[PDB]
Structure 1
Amino acid sequence: KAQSKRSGFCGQGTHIVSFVVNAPNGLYFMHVGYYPSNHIEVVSAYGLCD
């Protein structure tokens, strides 16, 4: 019904949408999985205090 946005019970990585189709003697699921596949180090600050 909705994007899981939580622990990956469904497709590995963040799951945008999941589509379910009947399988012989069962149900087959076809989730969509997002994988970054690249990581670049960026120095970051915790906003600012004024």
Structure 2
Amino acid sequence: IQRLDPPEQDAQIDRLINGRLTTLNAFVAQQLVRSESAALSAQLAKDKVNECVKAQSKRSGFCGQGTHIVSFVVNAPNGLYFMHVGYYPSNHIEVVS
């Protein structure tokens, strides 16, 4: 504004507007993508609390690795931190059955 008169001033302001409108559209598009993702993830967290923590799971790999025994949950900065305690076998031998 300080340097240019309206017919050119307009064009220059308009460049800044286009760039900023673009930036805000990109921002919003990502907040929508990120909030959609977090919401799906939240439903996964819901399932793990019910399947993992409030129950012993029989689903291989759903909770942790190995055979699930017990899980615990604490809060984390943007969600939940699952602590899955599993049973891990070792020193397998072969026998006849």
Fold conserved (TM > 0.5)? yes
Runs of at least 5 residues in structure 1 that lack an aligned partner in the other structure: 45-50
| Aligned residues with identical type, % of pairs | 100
* TM-score, normalisation: structure 1: 0.77
Q: Cα distance, 1:33 vs. partner? A: 1.3
Give per-residue Cα distances to partners, 1:1-50, cap 9 Å, x unaligned.
Answer: 11102222111011100001110111100010111111110001xxxxxx
Q: TM-score, normalised by structure 2?
A: 0.43
**Structure 1 stretches of at least 4 aligned residues deviating more than 4 Å after TM superposition:** none
**Bigger radius of gyration, 1 or 2?**
2
Aligned residues: 44
Higher strand residue share: 1
